Amino acid sequence: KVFGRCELAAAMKRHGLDNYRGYSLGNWVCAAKFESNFNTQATNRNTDGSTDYGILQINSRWWCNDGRTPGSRNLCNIPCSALLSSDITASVNCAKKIVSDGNGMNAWVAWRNRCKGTDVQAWIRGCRL
Ligand SMILES: O=C(O)c1cc(O)ccc1O
Numbered sequence: 001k002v003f004g005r006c007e008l009a010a011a012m013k014r015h016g017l018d019n020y021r022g023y024s025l026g027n028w029v030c031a032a033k034f035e036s037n038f039n040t041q042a043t044n045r046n047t048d049g050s051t052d053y054g055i056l057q058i059n060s061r062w063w064c065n066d067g068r069t070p071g072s073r074n075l076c077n078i079p080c081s082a083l084l085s086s087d088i089t090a091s092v093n094c095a096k097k098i099v100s101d102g103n104g105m106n107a108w109v110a111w112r113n114r115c116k117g118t119d120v121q122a123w124i125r126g127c128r129l
């Protein structure tokens with residue numbers, strides 16, 4: 001599913017990401033924009049052999065099982081394919097674990113390089129929330 005900007009903001013809010021670990025909703029929308037272009041089906045292979053999955057591009061080396069990433073820890077206890085669903089529940093629950101692990105949203109390269117230090121509130125402006 002390719003979400004609209006405000007559609008995804010509303011879904012993320014309903015699932016508890018607004019101000020989760022202190023990160024306002026616009027941070028999460030901005031991160032999804034630049035990780036996946038709001039596409040739940042996005043997949044991208046990493047140099048190290050792992051793959052990133054879903055709207056928040058969650059990585060198979062640590063967080064989910066894709067059956068082809070040697071050394072994977074599957075810390076979210078899910079198949080990576082669960083991160084590609086039109087239902088964002090699995091992606092959100094796994095993201096909550098990731099963001100809580102001490103490094104915050106710096107875990108997401110696109111957030112660090114394209115959202116952090118910007119007017120992230122812009123990503124939710126005009127949205128019914
Ligand atoms: O909250 C959700 O899971 C949700 C899912 C959608 O497909 C669209 C809007 C939403 O708010």
Ligand SMILES: O=C(O)c1cc(O)ccc1O
Nearest residue numbers: 030033034037114122123
């Ligand atoms: O592709 C981009 O860099 C981009 C940046 C924006 O601020 C808005 C939409 C986009 O597609």
